[PDB]
Amino acid sequence: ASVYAWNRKRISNCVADYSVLYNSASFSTFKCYGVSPTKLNDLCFTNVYA
Amino acid sequence: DKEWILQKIYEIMRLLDELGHAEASMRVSDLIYEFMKKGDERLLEEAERLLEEVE
């Protein structure tokens, strides 16, 4: 989607494996603020919205 | 990424001493100590914010 009217994907009731996206070399940048980027697989969130 | 963050915070306090603002440097140094014990990268944002207030 465009930045003005962005899309929101609901992530719920599942296992969220963040190791693929963390390790992937296809992405140019990553930054986490309220969480550590290496603890994402230990953490659990109420819901996740992309 | 963590290695670059530590280097940036280090450079910020070094500059604050050079600029004649020791209190700001001392505050940033404290951010370094905490950073080296944590995965919290917001300590860089604070080091940069403090530098901006000084400059």
CB of A36 less than 8 A from some CB of B: yes
Give the pair of three-digit tokens for residue A23: 């390790």
Method by which the model was determined: cryo-EM
* Residue carrying structure tokens 């940048």: A29
Distance (Å, whole) CA A20 – CA B13: 36
- Return the axis-axis angle of helices B2-18 and B22-35, rounded to nearest 10°: 160
- Chain A residues near residue B40 by CB distance under 8 angstroms: 36
Q: How many residues does chain B have?
A: 55
Contact B41 A31 (CB under 8 A): yes
